[PDB]
Structure 1
Amino acid sequence: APMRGYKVTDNERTRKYGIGANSLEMLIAKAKSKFPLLEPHLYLASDGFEVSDDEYLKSLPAQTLFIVSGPDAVITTDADFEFEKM
């Protein structure tokens, strides 16, 4: 498995990290080491879908932005977060 770069942030978009990971578990592990989460879940910042499998993750292009969040927490999408603080 090849290591790929991803951008991860919290739902309020305050901490922002780039992470190398060749699996959805490596990415989730690394995400939590850096985050106050009990069980962290990755969501596409674009539309908010949960990255559920390693397979759906490698579907995604490199440097895709994820929100890391609660287990079935609902995400402020990028369109909505950008629009809320204007």
Structure 2
Amino acid sequence: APMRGYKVTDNERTRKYGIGANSLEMLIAKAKSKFPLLEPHLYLASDGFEVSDDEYLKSLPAQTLFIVSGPDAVITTDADFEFEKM
């Protein structure tokens, strides 16, 4: 599978990385080396939906923004995060 670019940050948006990956397994492994998460899971920053498998990952546009967190995580969406900045 081809290498694609994705964007990953944590729920507080404290560290922001562009990461290249050709599978969900690779993207999680690269995220795990960057964030203090022992069981990392990837969620859409837009609506909090969990990227549950490699097939869903590859259905997304390149450069999609993900929140990395733990399993079954409460995710602060982009809209919620901006609203909380006021």
TM-score between the two structures when normalised by the length of structure 1: 0.99
Report sequence identity in percent. 100
| CA offsets 1:47-79 (integer angstroms, 9 cap, x no match) | 000000100000100000000001111100000
Separation of aligned partners in 2, 1:55 and 1:9: 21
Deviation at 1:38, TM superposition (A): 1.2
Query: Where does the alignment leave 5 or more consecutive residues of structure 1 unmatched?
Result: none
Partner of 2:29: 29
| CA offsets 1:2-30 (integer angstroms, 9 cap, x no match) | 00000000000010000000000000000
SS for the counterpart of 1:76 is coil
SS for the counterpart of 1:29 is helix
SS for the counterpart of 1:28 is helix
Query: Where does the alignment leave 5 or more consecutive residues of structure 2 unmatched?
Result: none
Which runs of at least 4 in structure 1 moved beyond 6 Å after TM superposition? Answer: none
